[PDB]
Amino acid sequence: MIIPALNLIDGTVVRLHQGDYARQRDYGNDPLPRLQDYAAQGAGVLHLVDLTGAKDPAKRQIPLIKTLVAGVNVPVQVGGGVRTEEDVAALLKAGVARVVIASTAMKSPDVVKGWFERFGAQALVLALDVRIDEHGTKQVAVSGWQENSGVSLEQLVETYLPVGLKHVLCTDISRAGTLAGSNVSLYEEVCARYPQIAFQSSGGIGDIDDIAALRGTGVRGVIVGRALLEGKFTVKEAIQCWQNVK
Ligand SMILES: NC(=O)c1ncn([C@@H]2O[C@H](COP(=O)(O)O)[C@@H](O)[C@H]2O)c1/N=C/N[C@@H]1O[C@H](COP(=O)(O)O)[C@@H](O)[C@H]1O
Numbered sequence: 457m458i459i460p461a462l463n464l465i466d467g468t469v470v471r472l473h474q475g476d477y478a479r480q481r482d483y484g485n486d487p488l489p490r491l492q493d494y495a496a497q498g499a500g501v502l503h504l505v506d507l508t509g510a511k512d513p514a515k516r517q518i519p520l521i522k523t524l525v526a527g528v529n530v531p532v533q534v535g536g537g538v539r540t541e542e543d544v545a546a547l548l549k550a551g552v553a554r555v556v557i558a559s560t561a562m563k564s565p566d567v568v569k570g571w572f573e574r575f576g577a578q579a580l581v582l583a584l585d586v587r588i589d590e591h592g593t594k595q596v597a598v599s600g601w602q603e604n605s606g607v608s609l610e611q612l613v614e615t616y617l618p619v620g621l622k623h624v625l626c627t628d629i630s631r632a633g634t635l636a637g638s639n640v641s642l643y644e645e646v647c648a649r650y651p652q653i654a655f656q657s658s659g660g661i662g663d664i665d666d667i668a669a670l671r672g673t674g675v676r677g678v679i680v681g682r683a684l685l686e687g688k689f690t691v692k693e694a695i696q697c698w699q700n701v702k
Contacts, residue, residue, distance in 0.1 A: 458667070458694045459533075459656060460494040461503040461681040462487050464517060470507065471682045473633045475585075475601040477511060483685050487520075488527045494684070495528045497691035501553070502532045503679055509537025510600035518546075525551045533581055535625075536600075541571055548579060556625060558583035559598040562605045562612060569619045577620040581656070584609045585627040588642070601629055613650060624653050625679065631660025633682050640669050647674035664689050664697050671701030 462469050465480070469487050473479035484490075491502055504524060509516030516537045525532045534547055535556025544555045555575075561568045561582055572580060585601060586594040586609050594609040609626065626646060628639035638660040647655050656677035657670055663683065670678055680694060 457500050457677050458691065458698050459501050459503050459677045459679045460491075460499050460684055460691055461505065461658075461679050462490065463505045463507050463681060464520065465507045467517070467520060469685070471633050471685060472507070475597075475627075475629055475632050477507070477600070477602075479633075488524055491524060491528050494691050495530050498695050499691050500530060501677065502528060502530060503556075504532060504534045504536075505556075506534070506536030507600065510535070511537075511602070513537035513539050521547070521552075522550045535581070535583055541567075541574065544571055544575060544580070548575065554579055554581045554623065556581040556583050558585060558596070561616070562596055562598050562607055565615050569616070572616065572619040572621070577622040581623040581625050582612065582616060582621060583625045583627070584612055585625075585629055585632075585658070586642075587629050588639075594642075597629060609646065610649070613646075613653065617650075617652075622652070622654060623656070624650075625656040625658055625677075627658035627679075628660065632658070634660055635662030635682060635686075635688070636660050637662055637666045638670060638678075640673060643670060643673040643675050662688060664693060667694055667697045668701055671698075 468485050469483040471481045506517050531553035533554040534552045538557050547555050585597050596605045598605045638657050643657050654676035657675045658679040661680045661683045
């Protein structure tokens with residue numbers, strides 16, 4: 457499924473080049489109508505990142521997120537700055553379908569295993585956003601991608617598989633926000649290694665052909681952010697492409 461994404465800094469829709477907070481482009485302070493148009497084009501799930509919160513969990517945009525989730529009638533997943541079990545509970549209570557977590561899942565595995573026990577694996581998406589080095593190590597980034605964690609994608613997948621891990625969002629950070637194309641080889645590999653996980657591809661989609669290029673990877677979701685903000689194609693066109701390649 458196509459998963460349109462919005463990223464938010466202090467109420468403003470933005471695109472960050474490779475997630476670099478010093479490299480923003482602005483797309484207005486009206487995310488709700490934007491999402492509603494996505495949903496009207498047929499979007500089945502929507503993705504929101506609270507970039508203000510990912511950088512400083514003290515400054516999460518909790519009121520805005522609540523308004524956006526309540527303002528559409530399709531499932532919304534939300535990430536950025538979640539740190540506690542109470543954070544997760546509050547998002548789910550406000551109608552969020554799935555809570556997307558990266559930092560704390562790397563930093564405090566015993567704690568997050570407890571979250572899996574309380575909320576169930578259907579309610580949690582593990583974000584494993586990676587900088588892939590020259591040797592091929594898929595190093596997971598945390599703290600709004602500002603920190604390189606020293607831990608691989610695969611180590612973290614194996615950490616949570618025994619407590620029922622089912623949803624993983626995997627961004628190739630080098631592609632994020634660049635329109636350069638998504639990392640097809642990355643998803644081919646990880647999807648095959650972990651057929652029991654529903655992977656969401658993320659970062660780099662630049663045109664309809666880039667979506668089509670993912671058809672054989674086995675990913676269950678295709679996140680698209682920048683290309684939709686720039687109008688490279690419509691959500692309806694993206695959905696048509698994915699329906700068809702499947
Ligand atoms: N610096 C960052 O940009 C960043 N930092 C954290 N995140 C997300 O925050 C959440 C993790 O937050 P913590 O739990 O670590 O606080 C996860 O959702 C991470 O992906 C970040 N993700 C931002 N944007 C994503 O980048 C991709 C861009 O796609 P494109 O436009 O089509 O090219 C899409 O998946 C966008 O949603």
